[PDB]
């Protein structure tokens, strides 16, 4: 439904307004039951995650509990590890920039709460290098915490020993990928690996590893504190909890606000954030989960609600839940065209289908914006699109195909007219 | 992506970490597991850039030696990521975000403003080498859509004029109040908090027993 209470919200420091430093955090009481929780043991913590129903919170929303659980298997003499991706690259995502900058601590105890759940020896946080200032904030926060003894040996009074580190990203969206974050951490080129050697099995430095969206790590301590039920109650069925929503582009007050997941879309922009610029009638389309997810046209928006189950019914992905809105004042053919330009300037090129395919769609898309290309070419891009969708080594090729598929699926008449417009003036 | 040796950009340019920098390099290596120094390539290479913006081929070679990694590896990392200059770069090095979110909120205007403000075209740098204009991609901070990254700072939610003001500040004086030069605080609802209006909660609240 929606309408989460501020009291039941998780990052009270969102929008700042409270010292992102420890003191403000102590008034927040973020480090309240940390020793106790870890004392409970890895299993109990992971269990709470399952009860929570917390899905990914990052890109694909895999059940968090089960995922983390995959490394709750006995150590084989290799130190297990925690990797917390804070790349936050998906266009439209400033979701994570908040927790890191505004509430660094929540993530610090998220790390150790999560750490004992997987029995990780240590956690490395890959904040995108672009955010240099952001990094300045977290290690100040990390430094505070150890000074306190909250982390490190004798973590918060626990025999558990966990060390948290921050790693510099270098302006790559793909670094974000789970197998590629690792390789950047490993120091090689940021190129994803194949899934058959799964991340838990082969870890960073060949030591079991797990990767979580920073939001996913951050909520785990509060969910254990509030209990899985409290959390699981807010969401709809499988889709559960309240996910932060970042609305950017063609909305009166673009902002990131956390609301009950499964909140109706027409409502999200209506209640928080602000009205669609030019009236709700001025809504050509919206991309619910960021650039990777397909945009949905207005007909669906009034009805569709932001939860992953509802969106997959709608053929779109909740993803990072970044709402980008396009008024009737925008050349979508060019809007999506720059996202394909966003992906040609960024895919690693390791795999044949993404390398040439994304460049191929970029060339066709640029011609489509001009209208130089004939109408028959439009359904070809479709066929080029699905060749890329199922054949890619990672998901980015998955992601490049979806916006192209959305433009053809709902805005096929407009592209034909741009086709027609150029043919007429000759 | 080919380094054709040039008198300026080639190893004749000797590179070596200042004593202090080497100390920093050591810590960086400590974070990673022992026996995995190679993992510190990115961090160390960055430090080199901090030392010299150009990050010449010589620098890349030094990084390799310092981390005992094959020279090619350093090259791969440098030529793969984008935050590494691999050429001389402007003192200010402004970067304008032009992904759809920003563009939808009129990013193009900002770029145009800069082009003539700077007098230099994108992909190029000012004669004094004070400013280098680059059309970079999503830099995060999308909510404050109109946004650009001057050097390390993130100037956000900027209207065309604001930048001119900022650029002037950069041109005469320094530290031009880096951040969103708008009424909004960070990424709050511009008009008024849609939530988080009430005071934050307290320790232990609604906590399940133990």
């Amino acid at each position: 439904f929606g309408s989460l209470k501020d009291e039941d919200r998780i990052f009270t420091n969102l929008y700042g307004r409270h010292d992102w430093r420890l003191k403000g955090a102590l008034r927040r009481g973020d480090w309240y039951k940390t020793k106790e929780i870890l004392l409970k043991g890895p299993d109990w913590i992971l269990g709470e995650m399952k009860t929570s129903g917390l899905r990914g919170r990052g890109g694909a929303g895999f059940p968090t509990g089960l995922k983390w659980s995959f490394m709750n298997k006995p150590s084989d003499g290799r130190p297990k590890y925690l990797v917390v991706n804070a790349d936050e690259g998906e266009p439209g995502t400033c979701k994570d920039r908040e927790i890191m900058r505004h509430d660094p601590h929540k993530l610090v105890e998220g790390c150790l709460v999560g750490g004992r759940a997987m029995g990780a020896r240590a956690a490395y946080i890959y904040i995108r290098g672009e955010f240099y200032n952001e990094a300045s904030n977290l290690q100040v926060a990390i430094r505070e915490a150890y000074e306190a003894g909250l982390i490190g040996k004798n973590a918060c009074g626990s025999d558990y020993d966990f060390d948290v580190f921050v790693v510099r990203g270098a302006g790559a969206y793909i670094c974000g990928e789970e197998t590629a974050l690792i390789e950047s951490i490993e120091g090689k080129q940021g190129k994803p690996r194949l899934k058959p050697p799964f991340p838990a099995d082969v870890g960073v430095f060949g030591c079991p590893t797990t990767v979580a969206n920073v939001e996913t790590v951050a909520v785990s301590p509060t969910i254990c504190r509030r209990g899985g039920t409290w959390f699981a109650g807010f969401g709809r069925e499988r889709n559960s909890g309240t996910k932060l929503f970042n609305i950017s582009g063609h909305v009166n007050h673009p902002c990131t606000v956390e609301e009950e997941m499964s909140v109706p879309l027409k409502e999200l922009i209506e209640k928080h954030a602000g009205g669609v610029t030019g009236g709700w009638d001025n809504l050509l389309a919206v991309i619910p989960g960021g650039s990777s997810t397909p945009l949905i046209p207005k007909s669906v928006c009034e009805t569709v609600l932001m939860d992953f189950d509802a969106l997959v019914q709608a053929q779109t992905g909740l993803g990072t839940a970044a709402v980008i809105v396009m008024d009737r004042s925008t050349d979508i053919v060019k809007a999506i065209a720059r996202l394909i330009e966003f992906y040609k300037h960024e895919s690693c090129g390791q795999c044949t289908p993404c390398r040439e395919g994304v460049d191929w769609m970029n060339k066709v898309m640029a011609r489509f914006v001009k209208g130089d290309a004939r109408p028959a070419e439009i359904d070809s891009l479709w066929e080029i699109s699905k060749q890329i969708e199922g054949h890619t080594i990672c998901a980015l090729g998955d992601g490049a195909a979806w916006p192209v598929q959305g433009l053809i699926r709902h805005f096929r008449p407009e592209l034909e007219d741009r086709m027609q417009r150029f043919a007429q003036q000759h | 992506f080919v380094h054709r040796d040039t008198p300026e950009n080639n190893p004749d340019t000797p590179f070596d970490f200042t004593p202090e920098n080497y100390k920093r390099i050591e810590a960086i290596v400590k974070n990673y597991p022992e026996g995995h120094q190679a993992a510190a390539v990115l961090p160390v290479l960055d430090l080199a850039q901090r030392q010299n913006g150009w990050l010449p081929i010589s620098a890349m070679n030094k990084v390799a030696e310092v981390l005992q990694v094959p020279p090619m590896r350093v090259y791969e990392v440098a030529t793969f990521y984008t935050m590494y200059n691999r050429k001389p770069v402007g003192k200010y090095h402004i970067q304008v975000c032009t992904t759809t979110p920003c563009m939808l909120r009129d990013s193009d205007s900002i770029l145009e403003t800069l082009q003539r403000k700077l007098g230099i075209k994108v992909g190029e740098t000012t004669p004094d080498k004070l400013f280098t204009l680059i059309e970079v991609e999503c830099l995060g901070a999308c909510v404050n859509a109109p946004m650009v990254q001057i050097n390390d700072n993130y100037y956000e939610d900027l209207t065309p004029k604001d930048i001119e003001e900022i650029i002037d500040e950069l041109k005469a004086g320094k530290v031009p109040k880096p951040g969103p030069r708008s009424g909004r605080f960070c990424c709050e609802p511009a008009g008024g908090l849609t939530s988080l209006t009430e005071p934050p909660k307290g320790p232990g609240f609604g906590v399940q027993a133990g």
Binding site: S136, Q139 | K23, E26, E34
Partner: peptide
């Protein structure tokens, strides 16, 4: 306001806290 070495130098300061290596 932060310096170019804030991240690295701060980290070095944290080195002492950093738990022993693997």
């Amino acid at each position: 306001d932060y310096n170019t070495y804030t991240f690295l130098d701060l980290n070095l300061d944290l080195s002492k806290f950093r738990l022993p290596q693997p």
